[PDB]
Symmetry: C2
Subunit: 335 residues, 2 copies
């Protein structure tokens, strides 16, 4: 789709941004490249990262209830709010995971120190919170309250998911591993990534009134969800050769859980051991059973399943939005 | 005061968090996070929420209030765990900082826990007071932590000693933002809201003028305690922080001491402190803290409502007692 226009709204978002930082009263503005620090921050973090999720809200927003003026902009804004929200999440993430890189540029916690990273996170959170309260002018009180409730659930869930991700207690005799993993992925990834933006979408959209069987869309966003997380995990096993990444950590991953549904007593002693220590050797075992083989299997049932539940949408017009959605996601994973 | 039983509602406050946690080990993780971080300490800021909220005794939004109080206790704890990382805190409230018992990745993550939680429990007050109140509660919170963060940025963003014509102005400006206003404006302003009191808005900026100096006076002491007792490189000076003492010493030092500070600032805090004592800076807090109180009292004495200068008399009493009955001899 076009989508160039959302992306052009940025500059009114920094207007709308900069036009908050009138925070102190009675001076000639000297103490006040604080306002310059955080515009910088925004260009760096919010101004990179594909803007996948903000797209999804603006996408979903433009079909369920086509717009034509003057709320159109309240949507772009939130879509950049989404992006600002996502960004703060992965600033946090890159810290916890000692990451190096993101959105092309190195990690913010790297450049501006970790102590500043932590402050800027909740800066971005607090601007998002207060920016969401702008809508009330354009969209009315209850439609912003439903937007709140959605912000809260998704960011909270992400926080419990991110907690499982951190949890030091992955064990040897683990046969629920597949269920630890996937249902964490639902929390730490699918909520903010797909649930939040899509469900944002049709608050602003406010149409149509689809209910009851509307657990269907939350069943697609779930799978899109782990579709993503499960692609991001593979690309890590496939595509980084550093002297410490993922399985260096005790990182509950897709190639590790289904190497635990195929491997033997002998293999599962392989993983257990040099996990956290020897990623190459663990990566080797991964090769042996060719992780990206079955990975290529996941993908087609994972698209098959999305496909068939696509053609079960009550909204012929929202049927195709998700088919659009499912399409770019795949492509985006296929790059 | 009591107060008993805002503290005793902590139980009922826990139950409401556990029920937020029907998602569905993590539960027992985060229930202990809150006991570890929220249950522990003086609870001064949630104490303030009720006090102000005290003198419409008509509904059982008296639980509701309490939970808010404990929501306010959560916000300070999740502020402060942030702080202890950024500052290399060792101990807070007599106990190992959270990022220490639970490392940085979790302390960072759990900050997000304490704060979404804050957000959710607030969101569910719509029933008890209804839409307009919550909406307004929602907007103190946003300013309060928003300014706190800017305030925390400034604490991180180091000053220019060389150009210290008025670092004091930075100091007090930073101070009002990183402290005053999640400590004082937010608690006080939540409680002014739940109450819905009659309402002397014109007479607002006065009590607003009070919170400014409740706040100032709060930090100013903290900064001096650190100066007075903290013995390490993990300290104010070694960490190169902008603080009442060094701010004053620049107001109070000849061109000798002041050049001799900005060199050991902040490597050999021993030497930085040596000066203060021969600036006798602890002399200068006391005449501060001395003038702090009456100016709060003058200030307090001008509150019109007369049922709202009451609790603002207890408020002023509480903090000064708090700030004065520390390590004395
Ligand atoms: O694998 P992670 O969960 O750390 C990641 O996917 C980020 N993330 C964090 C929460 N959900 C996803 P990324 O590989 O982008 O660093
Ligand atoms: O000295 P800080 O301002 O960092 C402090 O007073 C905490 N704080 C943080 C913001 N306002 C106050 P603490 O000495 O308790 O670590
Ligand atoms: Mg990561
Ligand atoms: Mg991660
Ligand atoms: Mg990853
Ligand atoms: Mg500190
Ligand atoms: Mg500090
Ligand atoms: Mg201090």
């Amino acid at each position: 789709y076009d989508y160039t226009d959302f992306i052009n709204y940025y500059d009114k978002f920094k207007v709308i941004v900069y036009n908050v930082l009138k925070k102190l009263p009675l001076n000639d503005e000297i103490r006040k490249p604080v306002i310059e620090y955080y515009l910088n921050c925004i260009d760096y973090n919010v101004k990179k990262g594909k803007h996948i999720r903000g797209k999804i809200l603006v996408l979903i927003s433009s079909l369920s209830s086509a717009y034509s003026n003057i709320k159109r902009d309240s949507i772009y804004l939130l879509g950049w709010v989404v992006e600002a929200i996502q960004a703060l999440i992965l600033i946090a993430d890159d810290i916890m995971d000692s990451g190096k890189f993101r959105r092309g540029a190195p990690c913010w916690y790297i450049v501006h120190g970790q102590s500043n990273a932590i402050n800027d996170i909740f800066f971005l959170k607090m601007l998002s919170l207060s920016l969401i309260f702008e809508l009330s002018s354009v969209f009315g009180n209850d439609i912003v309250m439903k937007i709140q409730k959605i912000y809260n659930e998704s960011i909270f869930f992400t926080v419990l998911g991110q907690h499982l991700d951190l949890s030091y207690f992955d064990l040897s005799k683990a046969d629920k591993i597949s269920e630890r993993y996937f249902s964490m992925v639902e929390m730490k990834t699918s909520r903010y990534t797909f649930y939040m933006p899509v469900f944002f979408g049709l608050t602003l959209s406010e149409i149509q009134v689809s209910s009851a069987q509307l657990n269907l869309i939350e069943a697609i966003l779930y799978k899109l969800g782990e579709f993503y997380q499960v692609h991001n995990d593979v690309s890590d096993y496939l595509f980084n050769d550093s002297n410490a990444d993922d399985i260096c950590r005790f990182k509950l991953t897709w190639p590790l859980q289904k190497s635990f549904e195929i491997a033997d007593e002998e293999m599962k002693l392989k993983i257990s051991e040099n996990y956290g220590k020897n990623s190459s050797l663990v990566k080797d075992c991964y090769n042996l059973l060719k992780i990206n083989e079955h990975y290529l299997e996941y993908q087609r049932n994972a698209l098959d399943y999305l496909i068939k539940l696509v053609k079960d949408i009550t909204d012929d017009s929202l049927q195709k939005v998700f088919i659009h959605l499912i399409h770019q996601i795949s492509e985006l994973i296929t790059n």
